């Protein structure tokens, strides 16, 4: 009755550039939107964050010692091309070579992401990915990295395209801070997926020998009342905004009738139109079968309730779609591991050409109590364990899951909660940058070297 994981499973830890690195204004690094934003809006910034720029050897040493065999790292676009394109910043390029060298030295396989919510400010201010000119610059950046970095065997274009559109254009929490613009949500989703398809194709055309894929945040959407058809429809439209539209562009090379129909309805109710070009679909179509793996980031599910009213998110409700409402008797965010099992099977069934799946992000963040130079984080251990258990079941049921990356490896900086909300396996005393393994890090060690979920 004890669940197990495959012997080749990768037990990883995740990090992101702006959240872990620090050195925001050093070694020719170019600015990102977060710089001004966090500055004049909060008492904290991304300096020093986790000081990964300097502490990476300590983190990779600890990663190896505790059984972590894979690590998600992201290259800061503003560190290579400070202005987005043009002049290459050699210190930025050196850094990553050093970082990748430490990983291989430590036996921690690096899974590298090119974009992690940090478009260089120069290009971000100029419409970000809504501006088609920026699709070219990304492709030039991706191409440079592919060639400049032969050490990397696992590449990823973007991390969470859905959450970007949602944050920048729907909820308006992240810059440009636009609110309720559903046309911009979908346009951003589209343009970014076109960027992805062109980079993936370019990688295969040039004949590189590694593996390339994309990481999507895929929160399962459920009807508040399964027996209520209006609820089922609200969930279906919600899933189209956040998951389906993006998944279709990724795996079908076009939007299915259900997606298009849903998108038309949502925009009819909320306004706007999409700019959809023939070359766009020519691009998506060429790439639909070239993804080696899919990265799924999952933390929790969402329940929808059909209820028509104005669009308001502070509370989440969309005109023509519905409202987010949590089930009355579900454990509590809200912990729902079945959500992940369902999302995995959905991908497997809807897009059978998915090939391979990696849970690229999953974790529990809260205010850790630091005692005895450690954290007795039993809550995080239980959350992770419960999620690893559904993975075991999904694999037994036929899904090709090959790895799990816990967000995060060490405590990193959060844009929404600064240094308060912690997710790491390793506690970081942010004043001294000293790491301390938590209880979970010891537990994760036993798991990696035993592959028995206990």
């Amino acid at each position: 009755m004890t669940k197990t994981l495959p012997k080749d499973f990768i037990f990883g830890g995740a990090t992101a550039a702006y959240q872990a690195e620090g050195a925001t204004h050093t070694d020719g690094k170019g600015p990102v939107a977060w710089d001004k934003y966090l500055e004049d809006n909060y008492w904290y910034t991304a300096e020093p964050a986790s000081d990964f720029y300097h502490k990476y050897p300590v983190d990779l040493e600890l990663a190896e010692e505790y059984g972590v065999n894979g690590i998600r790292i992201s290259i800061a676009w503003s560190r290579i091309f400070p202005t987005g394109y043009g002049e290459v910043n050699e210190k930025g390029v050196e850094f990553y070579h050093k970082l990748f060298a430490e990983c291989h030295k430590r036996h921690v396989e690096p899974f590298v992401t090119l974009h992690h919510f940090d478009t260089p400010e120069a290009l971000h201010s100029n419409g970000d990915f809504l501006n088609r000119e920026n699709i070219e610059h990304f492709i030039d950046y991706a191409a440079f990295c592919f060639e400049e970095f032969p050490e990397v065997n696992y590449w990823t274009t973007f991390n969470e395209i859905g959450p970007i559109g949602d944050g920048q254009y729907l909820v308006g929490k992240f810059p440009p801070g636009i609110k309720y613009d559903l046309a911009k949500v979908f346009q951003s989703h589209h343009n970014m997926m076109v960027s992805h398809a062109r980079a993936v194709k370019l990688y295969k055309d040039k004949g590189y020998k590694g593996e390339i894929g994309v990481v999507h945040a895929l929160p399962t959407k459920y009807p508040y009342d399964p027996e209520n058809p209006a609820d089922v429809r609200a969930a279906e439209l919600e899933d189209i905004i956040h998951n389906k539209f993006i998944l279709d562009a990724t795996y079908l090379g076009h939007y299915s009738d259900k997606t298009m129909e849903g998108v038309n309805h949502i925009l009819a109710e909320n306004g706007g139109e999409l700019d959809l070009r023939d070359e766009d679909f020519q691009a998506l179509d060429a790439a639909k079968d070239l993804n080696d793996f899919l990265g799924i980031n999952y933390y929790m599910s969402d329940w929808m309730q059909a209820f028509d009213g104005e669009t308001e998110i502070i509370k989440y409700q969309i005109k023509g779609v519905g409202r987010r409402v949590a089930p009355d008797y579900v454990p509590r965010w809200i912990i729902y591991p079945e959500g992940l099992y369902d999302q995995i099977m959905r991908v497997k069934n809807d897009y059978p050409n998915y090939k391979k799946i990696y849970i690229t992000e999953n974790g529990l963040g809260y205010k850790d109590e630091f005692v005895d130079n450690t954290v007795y984080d039993d809550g995080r251990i239980d959350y992770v364990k419960q999620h690893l258990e559904v993975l075991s079941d999904a694999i037994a049921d036929g899904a090709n899951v090959k790895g799990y990356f816990i967000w995060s490896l060490m405590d990193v900086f959060s844009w929404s909660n600064g240094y308060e909300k912690r997710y790491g396996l390793f506690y970081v005393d942010f004043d001294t940058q000293e790491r301390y393994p938590k209880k979970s890090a010891h537990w994760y060690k036993k798991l990696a070297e035993t592959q028995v979920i206990e």
Side-chain angles (χ1 to χ4, degrees), residues 3-14 62-64 66-72 107-109 111 358-359 384 388 391 395 402-407 409 425-426 441 443-454:
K3 316 281 192 180
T4 58
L5 290 164
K7 192 170 305 181
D8 53 23
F9 203 78
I10 62 182
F11 298 95
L62 286 155
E64 180 183 20
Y66 285 84
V68 177
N69 58 0
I71 189 187
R72 283 225 297 137
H107 308 100
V108 187
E109 185 78 50
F111 277 69
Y358 286 115
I359 307 299
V384 169
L388 283 173
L391 289 189
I395 299 171
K402 316 289 282 197
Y404 172 94
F405 290 84
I406 187 176
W407 179 262
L409 187 54
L425 281 176
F426 292 97
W443 175 81
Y444 204 71
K445 174 173 159 57
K446 198 274 186 183
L447 173 87
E449 307 175 340
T450 275
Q451 44 264 165
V452 164
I453 311 160
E454 246 191 303

Side-chain angles (χ1 to χ4, degrees), residues 214-234:
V214 59
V215 182
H216 290 324
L218 296 170
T220 313
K221 313 297 192 172
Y222 294 107
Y224 176 79
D225 184 339
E227 318 231 274
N228 179 343
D231 275 13
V232 165
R233 221 274 156 130

Side-chain angles (χ1 to χ4, degrees), residues 86-104:
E87 178 69 46
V88 171
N89 169 29
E90 293 191 345
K91 291 296 158 294
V93 176
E94 268 170 44
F95 171 55
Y96 294 107
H97 276 309
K98 283 175 179 160
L99 180 54
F100 301 153
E102 272 295 305
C103 290
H104 290 304

